[model samples]
Target: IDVLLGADDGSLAFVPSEFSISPGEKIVFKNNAGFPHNIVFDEDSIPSGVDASKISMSEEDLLNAKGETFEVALSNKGEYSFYCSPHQGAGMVGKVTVN
Candidate 1:
């Protein structure tokens, strides 16, 4: 699955904000609009066995390398929620369900 980090309208958001996949599937986040962004999982919202701390990027890291990609492997079965750290207030959030 591919999720775009920014939109064509110059908004701070994520395209296809919600999706589902089977366990072992991978979700890739692409910096489409070159906006500074980073993915951070909600530690309390992910599956019990999943480590939210393991999935994240810093704004500096993301801004320094626009168009780069971030990948997350869904190895647990449950709902996972995440957001762009710099744009969370703008509602740049997403959810993934692994089954």
Candidate 2:
């Protein structure tokens, strides 16, 4: 799926803020507005046993990627909540439920 950052309104957001998928599925975060954004998970929000380390992307790396696409593999079965590092305070967050 495509999660847009800094969309039309200039407010930080994710196009489809919530979604569900099967284990091993992938979600692609597309930088539609070319804003500097990176994903950071709420450590306690994800399901137990999920590898928290794999769910984060640094802003530096994200800004450096030419394609502006960040793909995350969902391997744990449960809710995964995350936010954009650059706009979390503005409520630029999203959730993914893996089943």
Candidate 3:
């Protein structure tokens, strides 16, 4: 599955916005935009706001520093929210639903 970095309609879109996967499936969060973004899982129904450096869920996959691409593997099943680090608050949020 691919998570879009921006809107597909030429507006602002974030990857899958809504995506699903089976256990052990791989999801690629691609940054096809010219901005920085991240795939941070919620810690407790709310954004953990944890320092990016302290997060252990594969920083390499969570962060796309060069406005590029990154990938993350989802073995657990649940829902997730990802956002652009600089634009999340501005409605750059996307969703990931794993089964």
Candidate 4:
């Protein structure tokens, strides 16, 4: 499924905020609004044994183009918590559930 990052309204948030996908499917994290956005997985919140960094960008890394994106394939069934490094304090967070 496609998950949008941030917004043009200056709101700190993920477009849907939460979503679900089947294992083996891919999640496309897109920069729809709010320039300089990136996805960072909360290491402790993902399924055990999964490396968060493999699916996430470095906290210091930022996406500056509109429609810019990164994709991650899920093979484990669990919930993944992520947030934009720069706007986290404004509640720019999202959750993806792999079922």
Candidate 5:
């Protein structure tokens, strides 16, 4: 699956915003418009047994060019809500439900 980090309207968001997939599947987030973007999962929103911090990427590991991608492997079966670190305040968030 795929998600876009930003829009051409200068809006900060995860295009598609929400999704559902099977466990162990992968999601690739691509930087569309914004210069640099990354994925940071909300600690409390993800599956409790999962270590969100270990999966979340840091600002220093940002995607800076168009089509730059962040690949996430969802091994746990539950919902994962995340956002872009720099755009979280602007609602650059998304969700992935693994069943």
Candidate 6:
């Protein structure tokens, strides 16, 4: 399935707000707005505020500078959290739930 996320005024936001995926399913993170952003997986499965060094599967793909889309396969069934490194604190944060 495809998911749409937006970046506005230096802040990031995801459409549908929440998402669910099955094990072994792949989720795509898209930047629908005009801005540079990155997707990072939270290591502790925390809801918000993540420490880069503690991220479990930190994927820095989907850089707006490179003009490419980032994809992550939900191999494990659990809650997944991520954010835009630069705009996370500004409400540019989001999460994913895999079953």
- Which candidate should be chosen as best, given TM-score against the real structure? 4
Scored by CA lDDT, what does every candidate get?
A: 0.80, 0.76, 0.58, 0.86, 0.86, 0.62
Quote the lDDT for 10 in model 1: 72
Give one digit per residue, the lDDT tens place, for model 6 in 9-89.
433576545788787787676667755666776666743443444433344444675235567666555677777666677
Provide the TM-score for each candidate, comma-separated: 0.87, 0.84, 0.66, 0.91, 0.90, 0.70
Model 2 per-residue lDDT tens digits across residues 4-60 = 765766668887889998887778887765377777777889987777778777544
Error of 4 at 92 (Å): 0.4
Better of 2 and 4 by TM-score: 4
* Tens-digit lDDT track of model 3 for 46-89: 22443333322332344545456666665555665655655657
* Candidate 2 lDDT score at position 77: 85
Clashing pairs in 1: none
Runs off by more than 4 Å, candidate 6:
7-11, 46-62, 65-67
The runs of at least 3 residues in candidate 2 whose Cα sits more than 4 Å from the true structure, single-residue gaps closed, are 59-61, 64-67
Model 5 lDDT on a 0 to 1 scale: 0.86
Give a tens-digit lDDT track for model 5, residues 1-99. Answer: 988888878678898899998977778888998759999898899999999867889755788899989888888888899989888888898889999
Model 1: per-residue lDDT, tens digit, 1-99?
988888877778888889999987888898877477888888889987777767656434564356778997878889998888878888999998888
lDDT of 4 by residue, 15-87 (tens): 8889888988988888887777898999999998999877889999988898899888888889999999999
Q: Can you rank all candidates by lDDT, best first?
A: 4, 5, 1, 2, 6, 3
Which is better, 3 or 6, measured by TM-score? 6
Q: Show pairs that collide, candidate 6.
A: 43-56
